Amino acid sequence: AVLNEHISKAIATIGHFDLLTINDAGMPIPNDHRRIDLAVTKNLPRFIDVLATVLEEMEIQKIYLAEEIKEHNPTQLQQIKQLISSEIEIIFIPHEEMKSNLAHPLNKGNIRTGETTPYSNIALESNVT
Amino acid sequence: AVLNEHISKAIATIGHFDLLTINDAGMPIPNDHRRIDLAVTKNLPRFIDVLATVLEEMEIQKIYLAEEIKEHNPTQLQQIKQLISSEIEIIFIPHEEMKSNLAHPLNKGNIRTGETTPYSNIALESNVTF
Ligand SMILES: O[C@@H]1[C@H](O)[C@H](O)CO[C@H]1O
Ligand SMILES: O[C@@H]1[C@H](O)[C@H](O)CO[C@H]1O
């Protein structure tokens, strides 16, 4: 099995209430030890493919999305909905809040993808591991 | 233009004779400052896509490939030949030496991809950059 080293590491540091984010190419991710840059070029890797992969390696209770996704990227939102269990809660917050959450005290990592479609950003809150 | 921060930073330090490698998922890359892990899952990203991207950002004079790629992965060899110029030398060395070169003194970065097809590894040698 092939997995990202930095992602597997971060997932192992993750417990109840901890956050892990997946982001598009333009999300202003703070430059620190949480930042995990997987971007290769435009749309590689895709946000959706990285999300599908991470979800196989995690127990999630809540996800956070930009309110703006509903209007500006309904295809992404639909792709996300189709991927997650129908029991996990989806909370919509302002995109400006999604940016603050990049620096959340419980944020255990910020994954950067090559995705270029707007508001392809998510935050994943762990259940009890 | 979307770009990897690590790859971009490594290339900024690359001069004549310096090496940069792109590798498949199972290649034993030493866990140091040179390790740039882009692997997501099986065959994502593909070796050939990462190679294509990097060659746009770099001027190369030679490449190193495993002798083993001729028999064991001829389609990858053909894909590499299609990507590189005719005025760049291809040198075949044993895979064991490809592994050694991950620690070469002039190695400026080891990129790991999600590639699963065997011997999908390369080392790129820089020309004069200024
Ligand atoms: O790329 C991100 C968002 O996804 C949105 O596209 C606006 O710019 C950046 O904050
Ligand atoms: O993945 C690499 C090589 O490409 C080969 O497939 C053997 O295993 C690893 O050393």
UniProtKB/Swiss-Prot annotation, chain B:
Function: Catalyzes the interconversion of beta-pyran and beta-furan forms of D-ribose.
Name the UniProt record assigns to this protein: D-ribose pyranase
Subunit and partners: Homodecamer.
Species per Swiss-Prot/TrEMBL record: Staphylococcus aureus (strain NCTC 8325 / PS 47)
Active-site positions on this chain: 16 (proton donor)
Compartments reported by the entry: Cytoplasm
EC number: 5.4.99.62
Residues binding substrate: 24, 95, 119-121
Keyword Isomerase listed: yes
Pathway: Carbohydrate metabolism; D-ribose degradation; D-ribose 5-phosphate from beta-D-ribopyranose: step 1/2
